[PDB]
Amino acid sequence: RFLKVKNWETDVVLTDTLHLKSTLETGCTEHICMGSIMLPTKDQLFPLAKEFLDQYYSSIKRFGSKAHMDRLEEVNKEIESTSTYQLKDTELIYGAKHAWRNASRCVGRIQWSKLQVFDARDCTTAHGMFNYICNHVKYATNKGNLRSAITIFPQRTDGKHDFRVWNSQLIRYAGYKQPDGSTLGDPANVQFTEICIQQGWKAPRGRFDVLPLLLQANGNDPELFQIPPELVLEVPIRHPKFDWFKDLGLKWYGLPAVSNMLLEIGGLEFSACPFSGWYMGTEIGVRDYCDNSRYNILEEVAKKMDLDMRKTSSLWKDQALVEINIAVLYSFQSDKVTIVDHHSATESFIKHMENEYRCRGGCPADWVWIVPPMSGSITPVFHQEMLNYRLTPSFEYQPDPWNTHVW
Amino acid sequence: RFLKVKNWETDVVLTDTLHLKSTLETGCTEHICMGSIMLPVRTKDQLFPLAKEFLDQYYSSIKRFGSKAHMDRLEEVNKEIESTSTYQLKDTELIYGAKHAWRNASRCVGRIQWSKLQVFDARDCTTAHGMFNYICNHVKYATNKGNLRSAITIFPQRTDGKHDFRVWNSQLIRYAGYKQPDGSTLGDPANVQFTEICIQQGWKAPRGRFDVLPLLLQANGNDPELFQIPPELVLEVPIRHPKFDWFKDLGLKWYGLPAVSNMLLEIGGLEFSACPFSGWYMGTEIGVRDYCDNSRYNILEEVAKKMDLDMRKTSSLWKDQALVEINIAVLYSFQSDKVTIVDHHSATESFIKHMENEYRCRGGCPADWVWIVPPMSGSITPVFHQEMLNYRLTPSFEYQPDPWNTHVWKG
Numbered sequence: 001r002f003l004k005v006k007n008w009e010t011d012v013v014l015t016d017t018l019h020l021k022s023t024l025e026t027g028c029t030e031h032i033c034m035g036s037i038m039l040p041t042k043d044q045l046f047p048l049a050k051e052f053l054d055q056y057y058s059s060i061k062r063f064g065s066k067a068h069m070d071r072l073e074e075v076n077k078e079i080e081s082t083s084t085y086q087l088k089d090t091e092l093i094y095g096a097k098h099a100w101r102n103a104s105r106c107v108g109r110i111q112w113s114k115l116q117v118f119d120a121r122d123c124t125t126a127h128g129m130f131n132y133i134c135n136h137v138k139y140a141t142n143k144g145n146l147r148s149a150i151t152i153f154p155q156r157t158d159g160k161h162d163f164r165v166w167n168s169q170l171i172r173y174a175g176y177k178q179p180d181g182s183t184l185g186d187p188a189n190v191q192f193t194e195i196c197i198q199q200g201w202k203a204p205r206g207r208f209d210v211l212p213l214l215l216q217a218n219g220n221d222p223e224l225f226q227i228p229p230e231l232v233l234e235v236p237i238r239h240p241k242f243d244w245f246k247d248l249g250l251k252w253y254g255l256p257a258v259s260n261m262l263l264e265i266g267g268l269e270f271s272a273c274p275f276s277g278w279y280m281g282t283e284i285g286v287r288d289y290c291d292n293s294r295y296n297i298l299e300e301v302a303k304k305m306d307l308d309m310r311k312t313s314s315l316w317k318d319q320a321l322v323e324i325n326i327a328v329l330y331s332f333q334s335d336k337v338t339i340v341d342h343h344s345a346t347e348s349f350i351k352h353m354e355n356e357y358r359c360r361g362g363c364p365a366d367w368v369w370i371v372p373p374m375s376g377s378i379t380p381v382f383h384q385e386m387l388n389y390r391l392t393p394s395f396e397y398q399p400d401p402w403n404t405h406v407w
Numbered sequence: 408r409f410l411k412v413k414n415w416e417t418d419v420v421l422t423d424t425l426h427l428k429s430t431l432e433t434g435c436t437e438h439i440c441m442g443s444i445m446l447p448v449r450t451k452d453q454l455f456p457l458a459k460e461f462l463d464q465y466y467s468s469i470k471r472f473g474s475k476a477h478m479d480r481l482e483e484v485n486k487e488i489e490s491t492s493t494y495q496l497k498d499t500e501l502i503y504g505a506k507h508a509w510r511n512a513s514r515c516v517g518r519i520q521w522s523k524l525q526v527f528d529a530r531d532c533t534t535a536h537g538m539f540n541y542i543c544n545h546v547k548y549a550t551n552k553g554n555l556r557s558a559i560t561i562f563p564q565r566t567d568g569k570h571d572f573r574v575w576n577s578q579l580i581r582y583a584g585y586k587q588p589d590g591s592t593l594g595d596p597a598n599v600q601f602t603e604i605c606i607q608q609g610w611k612a613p614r615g616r617f618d619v620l621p622l623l624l625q626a627n628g629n630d631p632e633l634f635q636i637p638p639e640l641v642l643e644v645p646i647r648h649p650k651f652d653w654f655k656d657l658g659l660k661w662y663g664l665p666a667v668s669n670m671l672l673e674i675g676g677l678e679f680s681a682c683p684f685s686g687w688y689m690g691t692e693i694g695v696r697d698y699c700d701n702s703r704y705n706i707l708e709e710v711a712k713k714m715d716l717d718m719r720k721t722s723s724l725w726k727d728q729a730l731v732e733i734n735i736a737v738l739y740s741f742q743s744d745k746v747t748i749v750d751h752h753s754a755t756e757s758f759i760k761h762m763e764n765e766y767r768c769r770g771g772c773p774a775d776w777v778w779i780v781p782p783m784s785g786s787i788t789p790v791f792h793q794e795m796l797n798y799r800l801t802p803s804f805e806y807q808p809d810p811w812n813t814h815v816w817k818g
C-alpha cells in the first residue's frame with residue numbers, strides 16, 4: 001500500500017505515501033478504470049474542519065500545541081452555535097495555495113506557493129464583485145508580466161445565497177449561431193452568449209468579442225458588466241516566417257482566468273473563486289484554435305501554406321499545427337506577455353513532482369490532462385507514471401448556474 | 408448497471424454493459440487511479456470454471472448455446488480436467504480464442520481488423536528447431552512481399568510451469584543494441600540486455616546500427632537456442648523524405664513486420680506462453696517512439712540540425728518541427744515501397760468507427776486512452792476527445808516476466 005511510480009525514460013522510481021491521506025473517491029473501481037472520463041449539515045462539517053486545521057497546524061510546525069487545541073475548540077463552539085465557521089486569513093491563504101497544490105490536472109503547480117490571495121469575503125453586491133474582479137484582472141495582468149492570483153467571495157451558507165460568476169473564465173470570446181448554420185466566434189460559448197444577449201448585452205456579433213461579466217451576489221439574479229477594455233490585454237497573432245499569417249485575423253487574450261469552479265477548504269464551499277495564472281502555448285494554439293468544435297482553423301491555415309490536403313498521410317494537419325503553435329508563442333513573446341511552451345512547462349512539472357515526492361511523499365497527477373495535446377511523447381511527462389487521487393483543500397467542478405438558478 | 412461514455416467533439420453518448428462480464432482486476436480503486444502505470448501452476452479446481460465460462464462464450468457466438476454439442480463438450484472437458492488436470496482446445500476454439508484475445512486488447516488501436524487473423528496452430532511443436540521453422544513460415548506468410556497479413560503462431564500451452572515454450576526475443580524482428588565502453592550506445596538501446604544475452608549464448612554480432620537480432624527459442628523448458636532468420640525473409644525499408652534529399656544520408660531504415668513475441672495468451676484458463684503475433688505498423692510507432700524517444704535512436708537533434716532550425720530555445724518548437732518531418736518520411740518510405748502502413752489519422756478514425764460498432768453489437772469496447780491516443784498530435788485525432796472505459800476481458804494477452812529472470816538453466 002506504499003506505491004511506486006517509474007519514469008520509463010530515466011528509470012527513476014519514486015515511492016508514494018501521500019495517497020493514503022486521500023479522502024474523496026476517484027470514479028474507478030477494481031473492475032473498471034474511468035481515468036479518461038471528464039466528469040467522474042452540522043455533523044458532516046466538524047470532521048472536515050478538524051482534518052484541515054490539523055494539516056494547517058502541522059504545516060506551521062505547531063501540531064498538538066495549545067494554539068492548535070484552542071482553535072479546534074473555538075471552531076467547534078462556532079459550528080455548534082452557528083452551523084458554520086469562518087476561516088482566519090492565514091488559514092484561507094493556506095487553503096487556497098493547497099487547493100492549487102492538490103490540483104491533479106494542473107501542469108503548472110511548480111508555482112503553487114506564489115499565489116496572491118484576494119479576500120473578498122466582505123463582498124455583498126454584484127457591483128462589489130465587479131470591482132474586486134477588475135482589481136484582480138489588473139493586478140494579475142501587470143502589463144503583461146502576469147502574476148498568479150485568486151479572488152475569494154463569501155462561502156456558501158444555506159445554499160440559496162450563493163455567490164457565482166456565471167462566466168466560465170473572466171475573459172472569453174462570444175459565440176453566435178448563424179442563419180448559415182455555421183458558428184461565428186467561439187462555439188464553446190454559444191449558450192452563455194445567448195444568456196448574455198437575452199439579458200440585454202448588445203453583441204458586436206464579431207469573431208473575437210470579449211464577453212461581459214455576469215455576476216451573481218448572494219443568490220440574487222446575475223447582472224451584466226463590461227470589463228474596461230484597457231484592462232483586457234490581447235495579442236494579435238503573427239508568424240516569424242509567414243508574412244500572410246496576420247491576415248487570418250487571429251488574436252487571443254493574455255489572462256487565463258477560470259471562474260466556474262468551487263474551492264473547498266475545511267469543508268467550507270467557496271462557489272465564486274476566480275483564479276488566474278498564465279497560458280501554456282498549446283492551450284490556445286492546439287485546443288482553442290484547432291479543435292474541430294472550437295475555432296477549427298486547421299483547414300484555412302493548411303490552404304495558405306499550400307500543403308497537399310488530399311491524403312491524411314502527408315501529415316498536412318500536423319504540419320499546420322506546429323506552425324500555428326510557433327505563431328502563438330512568437331506573438332505573446334514579441335508583445336512581452338508571459339507564456340510558457342509545452343516543453344518548458346512539462347520539464348518544470350517533472351522537477352516539481354520530484355520536489356513533492358521528496359518533501360511531501362507524493363504528488364497527485366492526472367496523466368490524461370498533464371501530457372500536452374501535441375507532441376506528447378517528446379515531452380518528459382509522457383514517460384512518467386502518475387498516481388491520480390483526490391486531496392483537500394481542492395478545486396471541484398460544480399453545475400452551471402443557469403441549470404440551478406431559480407429566477 | 409449502465410455506464411455512459413461521451414465524445415466531447417461530437418456529443419455522441421455510448422452505453423456500456425459489457426463491463427459487467429469483466430472479472431479480472433484493473434489496479435485502480437475507489438481511492439486511487441492507476442490508469443497511467445505501465446504494469447499495474449493453476450489448480451484443477453480454478454480451471455473448470457474458467458473453461459466453462461469460455462465454452463459458454465464460444466457456443467453462444469456460434470448460436471449453439473445449450474445444445475447437445477455444447478453440453479457434451481462441457482462434459483468432455485470436465486472429464487479431461489479431472490483425469491489429466493488440464494485440457495486441449497479444439498482447433499475452432501483456439502481460433503475463436505486468439506481472435507478474441509485481440510478483440511479484447513484494450514491497448515490496441517488496430518482492433519477494427521480483429522476478425523481477420525491467420526491462426527497457425529503449432530501445438531504439435533517439440534523442439535527449438537521446430538519453433539524456428541514455424542516462425543520462419545509465419546514471417547514469410549505475414550510479410551507477403553509487403554502486403555502484410557495479420558497472423559499468430561501458437562506453441563504448446565503451459566503444463567507444470569517447468570516445460571514452458573518461450574520466444575526470448577521481445578519481437579521476432581528487432582535491431583541489436585550495444586553499450587560502448589565510453590558509455591554511448593550503438594543501435595537500439597531498448598535491446599542492449601537481450602543483445603548481451605545472445606552474444607553470451609554464442610551469437611557473432613556484426614556490431615552496426617541496424618543488425619537484425621537472432622531468434623533465441625526455448626522449447627519444452629529446455630535451454631534456449633540461437634537461430635538466424637534467413638535475410639531474404641526480413642523485409643526492410645530505407646527511410647527517405649519526399650522533399651528533403653539529405654534525409655537518406657542519415658542512414659535510417661526500419662523493418663516492415665512488427666511481431667510482438669513476449670506476451671502470454673490466456674484462453675479458457677490455459678496459458679500459451681509462446682504466441683508471437685504480427686500485424687502492420689502505425690507510422691508513429693517508428694517515427695515518434697522508435698526514432699525520437701531519448702532512450703531509443705534519439706534522432707531529433709541530428710535531424711533539426713540538417714533542417715537548420717533555431718535550436719537555441721525550445722519555444723521555436725524545433726523538436727516538434729523535426730518530429731513531423733520524420734514521420735512524413737516514414738509514411739512516404741513505406742508507401743513508396745508498397746509495404747503496408749497506416750497513419751495515425753486513418754488508424755484513430757477507424758478505431759472510433761470500430762468502437763461505435765462494438766458498443767452497438769457487443770455492448771462495449773474496453774480501451775486504454777493512455778495507449779490509444781497517438782504519441783504526437785494527440786488532440787487533432789478523434790480518440791483524444793473520446794471517453795473510454797478500461798477493463799479486462801478474457802481471452803486476453805498478458806505480460807509475463809522476461810524469461811532470463813526466471814529460467815532454470817540445465818547447462
Ligand code: HEM
Pocket residue numbers: 100103105106107108109111115148149150258261275276277278279280283340345369395
Ligand atoms: C502560473 C501558470 C499556470 C500554468 C502554466 C498552468 C497550467 C495549466 C494547464 C495547461 C491546465 C489544463 C487546462 C485545460 O486543458 O483546459 C491547467 C488546469 C488547471 N489548473 Fe493550472 N496553471 C497555472 C496556474 C494555476 C493557478 C494559479 C491555479 C489555481 C489557483 C490553477 C489550477 C488548475 C485547475 C484547478 C485546473 C483544472 C481545470 C479544469 O479541470 O478545467 N492553475 N493548468
Ligand code: HEM
Pocket residue numbers: 505509512514515516517518520524557558559667670684685686687688689692749754778804
Ligand atoms: C493489424 C495491424 C495492427 C495495428 C496498426 C495495431 C496497432 C497497435 C499499436 C499502435 C499499439 C501500441 C504499440 C506500442 O506502443 O508499442 C498496439 C498494441 C497492441 N496490439 Fe495491436 N495493432 C495491429 C494488430 C494486432 C494484432 C494482429 C494483435 C494480436 C493478434 C494485436 C494486439 C495488441 C496487443 C496485445 C497490444 C498491447 C501491446 C503491449 O501492451 O505492449 N495488434 N497495436
Ligand SMILES: C[C@H](O)[C@H](O)[C@H]1CNc2nc(N)[nH]c(=O)c2N1
Pocket residue numbers: 036037038368369370415791792793794795
Ligand atoms: C475525453 C478526454 O478525457 C478529454 O478529451 C480530455 C483529455 N485530456 C485533456 N487534457 C487537458 N489538459 N484538457 C482537456 O480538456 C482534456 N480533455
Ligand SMILES: C[C@H](O)[C@H](O)[C@H]1CNc2nc(N)[nH]c(=O)c2N1
Pocket residue numbers: 008382383384385386443444445777778779
Ligand atoms: C508512463 C506511461 O503510461 C507510458 O509512458 C506509456 C504512455 N502511453 C503509451 N502508449 C503507447 N501506445 N505505447 C506506450 O509505450 C505508451 N507508454
Ligand SMILES: CONC(=N)NCCC[C@H](N)C(=O)O
Pocket residue numbers: 256257258275276277278279280283284287288
Ligand atoms: C493559468 O491558468 N491556467 C491555464 N494556463 N489555463 C486555464 C484554462 C484555460 C483554457 N485551457 C483556455 O485555453 O482558455
Ligand SMILES: CONC(=N)NCCC[C@H](N)C(=O)O
Pocket residue numbers: 517578665666667684685686687688689692693696697
Ligand atoms: C501489428 O503489431 N502491432 C503493431 N502495430 N505494433 C506492435 C508493437 C510494435 C512496437 N511499437 C514497435 O515500434 O516496434
Ligand SMILES: [Zn+2]
Pocket residue numbers: 028029032033034035435439440441442
Ligand atoms: Zn483508474
